[PDB]
Amino acid sequence: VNTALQEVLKTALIHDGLARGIREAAKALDKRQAHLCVLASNCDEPMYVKLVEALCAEHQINLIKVDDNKKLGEWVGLCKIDREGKPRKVVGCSCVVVKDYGKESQAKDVIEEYFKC
Amino acid sequence: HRIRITLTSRNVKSLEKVCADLIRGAKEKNLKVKGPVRMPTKTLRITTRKTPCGEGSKTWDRFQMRIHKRLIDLHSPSEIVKQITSISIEPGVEVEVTIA
Amino acid sequence: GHQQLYWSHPRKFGQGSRSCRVCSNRHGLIRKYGLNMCRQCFRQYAKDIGFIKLD
Amino acid sequence: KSYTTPKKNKHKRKKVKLAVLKYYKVDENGKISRLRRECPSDECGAGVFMASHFDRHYCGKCCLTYCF
Amino acid sequence: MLMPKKNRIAIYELLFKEGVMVAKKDVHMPKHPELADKNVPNLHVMKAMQSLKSRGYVKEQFAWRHFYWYLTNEGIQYLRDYLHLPPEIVPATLRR
């Protein structure tokens, strides 16, 4: 779920398993080093959603849909400046790929129950 | 049992004191001990200009550092040498244990 | 090729190969007995090496 | 200050705007094609792509030229 | 100052293991003498350490050519919440 995705993004921040963006994420996809993927459709996205769907849906890649790109910019580890209260500005990244090692958490079981149904 | 122990120091007095201490320890040990072999003294000479400038009278100063070396031969194994040389050593002297 | 041109000049020898231990100066170096100091700072720190002046 | 010779410059390199997505020619069917080749070098990864020109191909990190 | 992130996190772990850091004031060393396992120069180490000094984390000692950097308490705290480490391991300075 959403809190499980937030906790596994915090785990990726706490043990640097973040493949954020499209370039190194596509390199990890082509290098068979992709475990979990998140996608953000229904935005200003005429054909970019078609390109990211064609690149992601290749070899058993599952997605979690996010309504807005700025909603996931608080905990991914990107806009980590000016931590006195709210951050200075939140920007949106499209797709985040998680490559964590510490799988002894219930959030992994929650997201695997989401995927396996 | 032909061992040769070198003893080098900056000082002469403490060198002779620790040499006489080891000699009287070997004599109280009732062991055949050789005398001290006074090596020739090597002198390190440095002459340089006293001033940092090029101005003034051409005056030079002389620096010395004498080196004194002593030799002791003994007829005991290494543990007796260790137990006689590991106690009450001068801070200026240094040792080197060899076997031949 | 900046990474191979910044240090393209060899420094195996010459005056720039030597450097003072205390002030990184190329002038007035002593190489006797492996000291590698300038003359002024050797005069300043002459006492604690063991070099005494009695001639 | 100023000088009689004109001032020099820094090569502010031109930016890309979804350029590699213009090389990922994927149509509505199940056909995934790449307009630029996969890099034959084994010392690099599997995502770097060579530079495509009208008379030669230039590597990204391996610095190997595929010239006709 | 542009650098890879591997050498910076390496010298941060070197700060975490022992609270001392020694570098020589010359950019003409391709390798740190005790960091021959990694490809790190000396200019990156010096500029990162003086960046920590400017932010207010390390102290400075210099006589002839070597640097001697200490680890302050706020510097240790910044190390602790930057390396994402569990806050229970103590360095060798406090431990006897």
Side-chain angles (χ1 to χ4, degrees):
Chain A
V1 289
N2 298 340
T3 180
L5 207 64
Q6 177 169 341
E7 282 267 329
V8 74
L9 285 197
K10 284 198 272 203
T11 317
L13 198 48
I14 206 71
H15 209 265
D16 68 17
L18 282 157
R20 190 181 43 215
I22 47 176
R23 254 70 180 193
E24 74 162 348
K27 287 178 169 63
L29 283 159
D30 286 337
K31 208 181 286 185
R32 303 277 176 80
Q33 268 283 320
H35 271 161
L36 188 153
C37 285
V38 182
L39 209 64
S41 177
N42 53 88
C43 289
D44 275 321
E45 206 171 356
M47 301 215 168
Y48 182 76
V49 61
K50 183 247 191 181
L51 276 296
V52 301
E53 276 289 338
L55 272 295
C56 80
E58 283 200 90
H59 293 88
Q60 55 260 18
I61 290 303
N62 319 124
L63 308 161
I64 299 279
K65 199 58 69 188
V66 187
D67 55 355
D68 285 334
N69 276 302
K70 317 161 177 64
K71 293 293 183 291
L72 61 86
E74 280 286 332
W75 310 277
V76 65
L78 185 53
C79 306
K80 298 295 185 290
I81 59 170
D82 275 335
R83 289 148 168 144
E84 180 97 346
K86 61 176 72 68
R88 167 183 173 175
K89 202 263 182 183
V90 190
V91 306
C93 64
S94 297
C95 47
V96 188
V97 184
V98 188
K99 258 176 47 66
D100 269 311
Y101 293 107
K103 319 181 72 176
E104 306 287 331
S105 181
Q106 202 173 344
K108 190 260 289 181
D109 306 321
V110 166
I111 200 73
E112 280 300 313
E113 276 181 6
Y114 196 95
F115 293 150
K116 291 272 292 182
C117 185
Chain B
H1 278 280
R2 291 208 171 120
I3 56 175
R4 188 156 264 186
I5 312 298
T6 77
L7 196 64
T8 52
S9 161
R10 282 91 163 266
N11 199 23
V12 176
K13 300 286 100 175
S14 73
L15 189 71
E16 278 296 318
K17 280 283 180 204
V18 71
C19 200
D21 186 75
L22 188 153
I23 282 297
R24 73 174 165 257
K27 286 267 268 196
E28 208 194 17
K29 185 63 65 68
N30 308 87
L31 175 59
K32 286 185 181 297
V33 59
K34 276 201 151 170
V37 182
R38 267 70 55 89
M39 282 335 297
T41 287
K42 287 313 191 262
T43 302
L44 276 81
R45 285 271 182 85
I46 299 283
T47 60
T48 181
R49 292 285 292 278
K50 324 167 79 157
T51 183
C53 285
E55 191 294 339
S57 296
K58 303 299 175 287
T59 57
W60 298 69
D61 62 358
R62 286 80 170 265
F63 288 92
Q64 303 224 350
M65 201 195 48
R66 281 75 178 272
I67 281 180
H68 322 287
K69 179 178 183 183
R70 315 265 176 264
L71 288 175
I72 292 294
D73 291 331
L74 207 61
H75 300 103
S76 67
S78 177
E79 61 97 15
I80 288 182
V81 177
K82 180 179 297 192
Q83 87 176 0
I84 200 66
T85 52
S86 51
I87 290 182
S88 85
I89 196 74
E90 307 277 349
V93 308
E94 279 198 7
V95 295
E96 171 86 50
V97 190
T98 45
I99 182 164
Chain C
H2 188 203
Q3 68 272 15
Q4 55 196 3
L5 188 141
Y6 196 72
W7 294 333
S8 177
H9 196 176
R11 51 201 90 191
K12 311 305 207 303
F13 51 87
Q15 194 150 21
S17 61
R18 264 71 50 91
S19 187
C20 195
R21 196 192 307 274
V22 57
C23 54
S24 298
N25 206 10
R26 276 92 163 93
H27 289 287
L29 210 69
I30 49 175
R31 299 165 90 237
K32 216 171 168 179
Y33 316 111
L35 272 155
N36 286 137
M37 285 191 256
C38 61
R39 41 197 199 100
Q40 310 95 10
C41 287
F42 169 62
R43 286 199 59 249
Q44 163 182 3
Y45 313 128
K47 270 312 285 197
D48 48 3
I49 310 290
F51 274 83
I52 51 160
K53 178 192 178 201
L54 73 165
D55 189 22
Chain D
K1 61 166 191 64
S2 182
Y3 206 54
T4 63
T5 77
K7 50 153 184 185
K8 270 293 301 192
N9 50 354
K10 196 177 280 188
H11 182 60
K12 179 249 161 183
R13 310 146 188 265
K14 62 180 74 174
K15 300 311 196 305
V16 289
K17 204 55 199 67
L18 316 172
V20 69
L21 296 193
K22 299 266 207 214
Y23 276 76
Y24 289 160
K25 192 59 177 182
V26 185
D27 290 336
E28 89 270 11
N29 277 318
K31 293 180 182 179
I32 304 171
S33 65
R34 303 157 195 82
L35 300 186
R36 44 180 60 244
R37 305 150 47 99
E38 287 279 323
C39 194
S41 177
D42 208 19
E43 284 93 302
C44 62
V48 294
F49 288 151
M50 72 274 297
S52 288
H53 299 131
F54 43 85
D55 49 333
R56 77 280 189 192
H57 297 157
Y58 203 80
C59 179
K61 288 164 52 167
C62 69
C63 197
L64 178 79
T65 57
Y66 284 159
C67 53
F68 191 16
Chain E
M1 257 295 296
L2 60 90
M3 62 285 277
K5 280 212 71 73
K6 38 189 289 184
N7 63 7
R8 274 171 91 191
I9 62 170
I11 60 160
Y12 271 68
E13 309 170 19
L14 283 161
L15 272 192
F16 185 65
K17 191 203 296 314
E18 208 156 15
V20 295
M21 193 36 88
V22 172
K24 190 184 252 177
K25 190 189 179 294
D26 54 326
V27 304
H28 318 275
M29 294 183 286
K31 309 297 182 289
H32 216 294
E34 69 194 40
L35 281 75
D37 289 326
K38 304 172 151 233
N39 198 358
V40 53
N42 194 57
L43 179 61
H44 303 101
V45 182
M46 271 177 314
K47 287 328 207 167
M49 273 296 166
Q50 75 99 30
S51 188
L52 264 72
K53 182 176 173 66
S54 301
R55 296 190 90 133
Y57 296 134
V58 298
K59 291 174 71 175
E60 168 65 33
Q61 298 290 328
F62 189 80
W64 309 357
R65 277 179 75 177
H66 271 208
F67 284 84
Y68 311 86
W69 289 296
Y70 292 167
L71 259 187
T72 55
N73 296 318
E74 182 65 26
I76 286 163
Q77 165 152 343
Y78 165 70
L79 183 63
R80 181 189 304 122
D81 63 358
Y82 189 81
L83 267 298
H84 295 306
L85 60 89
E88 59 98 11
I89 316 184
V90 63
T93 69
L94 286 81
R95 180 218 276 193
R96 301 180 72 251

